[PDB]
Design an enzyme around this catalytic site. Structure first.
Site, mmCIF file in Angstrom:
data_model
loop_
_atom_site.group_PDB
_atom_site.id
_atom_site.type_symbol
_atom_site.label_atom_id
_atom_site.label_comp_id
_atom_site.label_asym_id
_atom_site.label_seq_id
_atom_site.Cartn_x
_atom_site.Cartn_y
_atom_site.Cartn_z
ATOM 1 N N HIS A 118 0.870 -1.299 -0.162
ATOM 2 C CA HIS A 118 -0.276 -0.047 -0.073
ATOM 3 C C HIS A 118 1.060 1.463 0.014
ATOM 4 O O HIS A 118 0.299 2.461 -0.282
ATOM 5 C CB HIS A 118 -0.923 0.157 1.241
ATOM 6 C CG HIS A 118 -0.419 -0.278 2.475
ATOM 7 N ND1 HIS A 118 -0.428 -1.477 3.199
ATOM 8 C CD2 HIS A 118 0.704 0.543 3.244
ATOM 9 C CE1 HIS A 118 0.474 -1.669 4.257
ATOM 10 N NE2 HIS A 118 0.988 -0.233 4.328
ATOM 11 N N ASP A 129 -0.341 -8.593 1.843
ATOM 12 C CA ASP A 129 -0.029 -7.351 1.864
ATOM 13 C C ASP A 129 1.205 -6.875 1.794
ATOM 14 O O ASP A 129 1.711 -6.050 2.828
ATOM 15 C CB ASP A 129 -0.983 -6.554 2.974
ATOM 16 C CG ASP A 129 -0.879 -4.998 2.847
ATOM 17 O OD1 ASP A 129 -1.670 -4.335 1.935
ATOM 18 O OD2 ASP A 129 -0.154 -4.318 3.658
ATOM 19 N N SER A 132 5.470 2.377 8.762
ATOM 20 C CA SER A 132 5.155 0.869 8.370
ATOM 21 C C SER A 132 6.454 0.340 7.266
ATOM 22 O O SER A 132 7.138 1.214 6.921
ATOM 23 C CB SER A 132 3.951 0.863 7.664
ATOM 24 O OG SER A 132 2.773 1.005 8.376
#
Lengths: 159, 47, 47, 159
Positions: free
Chosen positions: A36, A58, A110
């Site tokens: 993402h 992911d 992240s």
């Protein structure tokens, strides 16, 4: 003590229009980048690498070149209960969940590997949702047999 | 006599129709079973 | 034409579910940093 | 200092072109040398000794005379994690892989034996590939069942 776990140059930032929005980390001879997160890795040799996506877990993984395999994190299949070291600060593992103080982890925090007390990666955090004082974290870890199980709290908040 | 809708369909035509319509359903069932088995296996191997 | 269309749709769907099942059964083992995949290849020979 | 003081004269250079190109080692009553080194062993008795070829394992071996079985290296079947003695320096056994620091090992170094802290040969090398700051080695070791599993890394530069 805690400063002896931030001297890891093997991590790499992701640049988007000159800003930071995520980190791509190399572990065990493979480069993992959160899916993402949009941008380009600053390192040219790693940016030129073609990565294969993984929608369910992911994160996108790529095979690092031979000359880069030497200097790379080492993963661990055992995750003992208790203390852990992170760049932002201390983390604690309880009942299968990583928790950090509130306000730890935000926009662009992240893809950061979570280090153990020994000094080797045990998992990669992709996001976190606040739960009172201690913010829970969505994090992908590695099982003893190597199935790369993911634990994600309910209504997880990105980054 | 009188002509029925399926009056003139031979056994060979019936077998071909069953293979085309009835074998494709078998392939779909096989794929569904494989997908369910894989999903159950991966879900049970997470914990 | 209806039979051919149904057969083609069935074959394409079966291939799609088979590929999805292979991906869902390999990626948990594939993205391990050392890439150890003995068990799935031994039980089903997906690759 | 201590890593190099473990010196044994059982290893014998192979001579052709009048220069060093590799070492042949006597272990457990068998003399080993690879395909790569051509010429005659310095020891005349072993130079005249016939050898049986094993091309797939990249080593030919010869049965030493019964008298010389008294003085030879002792093989090892267990491979504890960590550092090992060698002719050049410490060799790290990690993740089922033998690794040496930068620059250590080059052409003509093939065939040397890797020993342990006890002082017995645990494996013998045949080539090395530079993985970066840490260099991986192509090496054959000995198992508990005596199957002699050899480890050949990807696109290894063949010493």
């Amino acid at each position: 003590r805690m400063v002896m776990k931030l001297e890891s140059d093997k991590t790499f930032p992701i640049m988007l229009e000159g800003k930071i929005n995520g980190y791509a980390c190399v572990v065990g001879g493979k480069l993992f980048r959160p899916m993402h997160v949009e941008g380009k890795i600053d390192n040219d040799v790693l940016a030129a690498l073609k990565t294969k996506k993984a929608s369910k877990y992911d994160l996108e993984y790529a095979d690092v070149p031979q000359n880069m395999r030497a200097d790379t994190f080492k993963y661990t299949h055992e995750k003992p209960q208790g203390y852990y070291s992170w760049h932002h600060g201390a983390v604690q593992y309880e009942n299968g969940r990583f928790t950090v103080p509130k306000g730890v982890g935000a926009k662009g925090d992240s893809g950061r590997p979570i280090l153990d007390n020994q000094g080797r990666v045990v998992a990669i955090v992709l996001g976190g949702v606040n739960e009172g004082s201690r913010t829970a974290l969505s994090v992908v870890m590695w099982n003893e047999k190597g199935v790369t199980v993911k634990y994600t709290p309910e209504n997880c908040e990105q980054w | 006599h009188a002509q029925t809708f399926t009056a003139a369909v031979s056994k060979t035509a019936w077998t071909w129709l069953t293979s085309l319509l009835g074998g494709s359903a078998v392939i779909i069932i096989i794929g569904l079973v494989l997908a369910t088995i894989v999903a159950m296996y991966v879900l049970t191997n997470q914990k | 034409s209806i039979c051919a269309a149904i057969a083609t749709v069935s074959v394409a769907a079966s291939t799609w579910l088979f590929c999805r099942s292979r991906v869902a059964c390999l990626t948990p083992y594939r993205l391990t940093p050392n890439a150890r995949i003995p068990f799935c290849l031994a039980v089903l020979c997906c690759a």
